[PDB]
C-alpha cells in the first residue's frame, strides 16, 4: 500500500540533523 | 600602624599535635615538623583538587 | 500486518539522539 | 511467529547508549 | 508507479548538506 | 527451530560494551 | 524505462562536492 | 546441521576483545 | 542495452577526485 | 562439504590481531 | 559478454590513488 | 571447484597486514 | 569461465598497498 506522511517526516528530520550537523562545522577563522 | 600579618594555614600541622604545642615547640627550636601526606592533602597530592 | 506504534516512537528517539549529537557540537568560538 | 518483549528492550538500550554517547559528548565552554 | 516530487527534493536536499559540508572545511590560512 | 540463551546474552553483552564505550568517554571539565 | 536527466545532474553534483572536499585540504605549508 | 562449541567461543572472544577496547579508554581525570 | 558514454566520465571524475585527496596529504617535511 | 582446519585459524588469527589492537591502546596515565 | 579494456584501467587507477595515498604518510622523523 | 593455494595465501597476507597495523600502534610510554 | 592473471596481479597490489600503510605508521620513538 502507500502513505508518506511518516516517511515524508522522519526524511526532512534526518535531513535537518545532517544540515545542523553540517553547519555545527563553521567557523570564522582569526589570527592573520 | 601595626606589623605585617602572615596568614598562616594549619593544614600540615602533624596528626596529634596541638597547635599551641606546635608552635611553641617552633618557637624553640625554629624547625616545625609538617606532614606533607596529611589526609586534608590527598587531593591536591592526587590530583583531584588544585 | 501492520502497526507503529513502536517502530514510530524508536525511529524519533533515533532521530533525536541525532538531534543532540548535531547540536552538542555547536561552538561559539573566541580569540578573535 | 511473534513476540517482543526481548527485541523492544534491546532497541531501547541501543538507543540509550546512543544517547549517552550523545549527551557524553556536550561541554560548556570557556576561555572568552 | 512513478512521482519524484518527493524523492528529487530529497536528493536536492542531501546534496546541499554536502554542499555545505564541503565549503565549511574550507580556510585561507596564516602564518607564513 | 529456536532458542534465545545463547543468542540474548551475546546481545546484552555487546550492548554492555557500547554501554562502556559510552560511558568511558563522560568528563567533568576543568578551567573555567 | 529510462530517461537520465536528474540522474546525470545529481551524480555531477555528488561528483563536484567531492571535489570541494578533496580540494579543501589543500594547503601550502610554511615553517621551513 | 549444528553445533556451536566453536561459534560460541568466537562471538565470546570477539565480545571480550570489544570489551577490552572499551576499558583501555578509560581515565581518571586530572587538572581541576 | 549497453552505453559507457556517461558511466566512464562519471568514473574518471570518481578517480581524479580521489587523485586530488591522494595528492592534497603530501608533505614535505621541516624542523630536522 | 565440511572442514575448518583453515578456517578456525584464520578466525583465530582475527580475534588475535584484534586482541592485539585492543591491548596496544592501554596507557597507565601520568601527571596527577 | 566481455571487454576489460576499461575496467582493467579503473581497477589500476584505483590502486595507484591507493598507493599514493599510503606513501603519502610516509615520514622519516627527527627529535631524537 | 576448488583449490585454495592462492585464497589461502592472500587470507594469510590481509591477516599479516592487519598484525603490522595492530603492532605499530604499540609505544612504551614516558613522562612519568 | 576462468582465469586469475589479472585478478591475481590487482589483489596482490591491494595487498602491497595494505603493506605499506601499515609499515608507514610505524615510528621508533624518543623522549624517554
Redesign the interface.
Known sequence: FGSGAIGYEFDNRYLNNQEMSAVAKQRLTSLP | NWGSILELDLSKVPKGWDVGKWMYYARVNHIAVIDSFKEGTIGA??????
Open positions: 597530592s592526587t590530583g583531584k583538587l588544585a
